[PDB]
């Protein structure tokens, strides 16, 4: 019985119109042969995306004229636009260039997004400090939804309900949760055993790791 409470409340449908590339080290004829022989074809492999791993871009590791603060900010819309149909993504699979492209077929009532802010370097495991400029009042994913059923989803105005930020160094790090409480409007930030009050503008300041938004 796949229609579980969790599967119905926090799991959605994504239609990954994914493809592959023939070869980087081949001429035009050999590449076109695989492009036409379904060896580099585009296929729809629509699955159930319980969590949308919106990947943040790596820090430029270089200063600029603007950005008085040296923390590279990033808008949520640009971050979440990767999952849209137009934005193609490449996967460095073994002996292949899996150039794919995703598309959200159906949105869950409570979308859960977990930005992978921590990666592994060639000799260590660094955490990307880029901030996610995510408005926490109203947002719509219809600008990144699939064109086939764009009008099928009547409601698209989703608002963030809870954010969990992992502050500190990767090895020694603290896990704080900034949750927007219902009943009232205050988005309280809760430590392990300390409950504080966080300003809504300050919620979008701390680097979030896992976010859960209510589609209203």
């Amino acid at each position: 019985k796949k229609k579980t409470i969790v599967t119905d409340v926090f799991q959605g449908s994504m239609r990954i119109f994914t493809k592959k590339l023939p070869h980087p080290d081949l001429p035009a004829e050999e590449k076109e042969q695989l492009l036409h022989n379904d060896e580099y074809q585009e296929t729809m492999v629509e699955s159930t995306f319980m969590y949308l791993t919106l990947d943040l871009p790596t820090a430029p590791l270089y200063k600029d004229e603007k950005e008085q603060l040296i923390i590279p900010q990033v808008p949520l819309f640009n971050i979440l636009a990767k999952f849209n149909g137009i934005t193609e993504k490449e996967y460095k699979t073994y002996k292949e260039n899996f150039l794919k492209r995703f598309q959200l077929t159906k949105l869950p009532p409570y979308l859960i997004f977990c930005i992978k802010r921590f990666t592994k370097n060639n000799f260590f495991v660094e955490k990307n400090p880029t901030i996610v400029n995510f408005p926490i009042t109203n947002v719509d994913l219809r600008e990144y939804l699939s064109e086939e059923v764009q009008a099928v989803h009547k409601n698209t105005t989703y608002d963030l309900i809870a954010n969990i930020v992992h502050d500190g160094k990767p090895s020694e790090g603290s896990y704080r949760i900034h949750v927007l409480h219902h009943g009232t409007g205050k988005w309280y930030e809760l430590q392990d055993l300390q409950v504080t009050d966080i300003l809504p503008q300050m919620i979008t300041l701390s680097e979030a790791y896992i976010q859960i938004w209510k589609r209203r």
């Binding site: 200063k63 603060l69 040296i70 000799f123 260590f124 400090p129 701390s206």
Partner: protein, 369 residues
């Protein structure tokens, strides 16, 4: 000796990995199928003498075909240099540890074969032959001298010594006291047969090969330079390679000092490659600095240059981390909340008022002290 034998048995038992499934190919039967081999039947003494002669001939071929005619191999398989030689000839006289081990094994085999021949030539009695075999197997590390060729054989030598001690102390009891007549040599024979069977693949591979027919920064810089040069045309590789190297150096020095590297006149793929190289070098440098700091804290052996380089890298990393922390403090604002700060200020004011501490004024124009 008994404890050492028990240790060897327990080691051979705990490591009893069951054998693997081979294809059951017989090397001896394969060589028999080969047209370049004949078959006959002869006494073990004659075959041993023939094998000793063949081994001597093979050693002579290995020490003569290499034009190293300044040394001679004795009939006892103890190769001794003929006369003095120069450093060039000394390097030419380099005898590999595999060669030394093979020479020692051949010497032991020739000694055993000659002892058998003497037993079959009427030189000594059969009991004397057994005693000679016991001597040629136990307490034979001194005679063979194979320990220097391969240090690992010292374990087998100690096992043979323990077997000799046990056999002695058991047999030499009652009317038969201490003496040289102990002829029980099966144990040492088995030990040396096992050692030879283990050693055989390495020596065979060496003989077959003879007869035929930490630095991530420099490596990454060399790889990037090679890639750029191979991509660069011959019309631009005459003098602009130094320019590309200088640009890479500027990028490296830029990331190490928080100064942005801005080359707007450079190609976008060139900038991407430079940025990738800079990121790789930064990761390698950070890992190396962390490892060096850990080693220094633990108490590893370093030098003044290494200590200076590690201190510089650690200082640069600490400065970058402090800059990042200050930037985050500016971004995150004051960590102390307004209410907590007000409460702390009120407490300090109350404490000062209770102490009635008169504030220290600005230094007057005519201060006494």
């Amino acid at each position: 000796s008994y404890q050492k034998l028990l240790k060897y048995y327990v080691l051979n038992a705990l490591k009893h990995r069951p054998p693997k499934a081979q294809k059951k190919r017989y090397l001896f039967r394969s060589f028999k199928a080969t047209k370049f081999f004949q078959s006959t039947k002869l006494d073990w003494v004659e075959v041993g003498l023939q094998v000793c002669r063949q081994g001597y001939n093979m050693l002579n071929l290995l020490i003569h075909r290499k034009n190293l005619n300044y040394l001679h191999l004795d009939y006892n398989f103890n190769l001794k240099p003929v006369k003095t030689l120069t450093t060039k000839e000394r390097k030419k006289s380099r005898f590999g540890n595999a060669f030394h081990l093979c020479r020692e094994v051949l010497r032991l085999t020739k000694l055993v074969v000659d002892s058998h021949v003497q037993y079959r030539l009427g030189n000594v009695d059969a009991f004397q032959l057994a005693d000679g075999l016991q001597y040629i197997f136990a307490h034979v590390g001194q005679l063979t001298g194979m320990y220097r060729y391969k240090y690992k054989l010292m374990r087998q030598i100690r096992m043979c010594k323990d077997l000799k001690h046990l056999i002695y102390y058991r047999f030499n009891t009652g009317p038969v006291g201490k003496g040289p007549g102990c002829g029980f040599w099966a144990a040492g024979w088995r030990v040396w047969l096992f050692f030879m069977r283990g050693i055989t693949p390495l020596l065979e591979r060496w003989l077959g090969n003879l007869l035929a027919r930490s630095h991530f920064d420099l490596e990454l810089r060399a790889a990037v330079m090679h890639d750029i040069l191979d991509m660069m045309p011959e019309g631009i590789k005459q003098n602009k390679a130094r320019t590309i190297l200088q640009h890479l150096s500027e990028a490296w020095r830029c990331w190490k000092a928080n100064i942005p590297w801005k080359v707007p006149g450079l190609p976008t793929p060139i900038e991407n490659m430079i940025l990738r190289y800079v990121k790789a070098k930064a990761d390698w440098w950070t890992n190396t600095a962390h490892y060096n700091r850990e080693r220094i804290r633990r108490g590893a052996t370093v030098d003044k240059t290494v200590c200076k380089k590690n201190l510089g890298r650690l200082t640069r990393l600490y400065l970058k981390a402090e800059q990042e922390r200050q930037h985050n403090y500016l971004k995150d604002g004051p960590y102390i909340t307004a209410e907590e700060a007000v409460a702390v200020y009120t407490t300090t004011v109350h404490w000062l008022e209770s102490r009635r501490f008169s504030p220290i004024p600005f230094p007057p124009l005519s201060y006494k002290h």
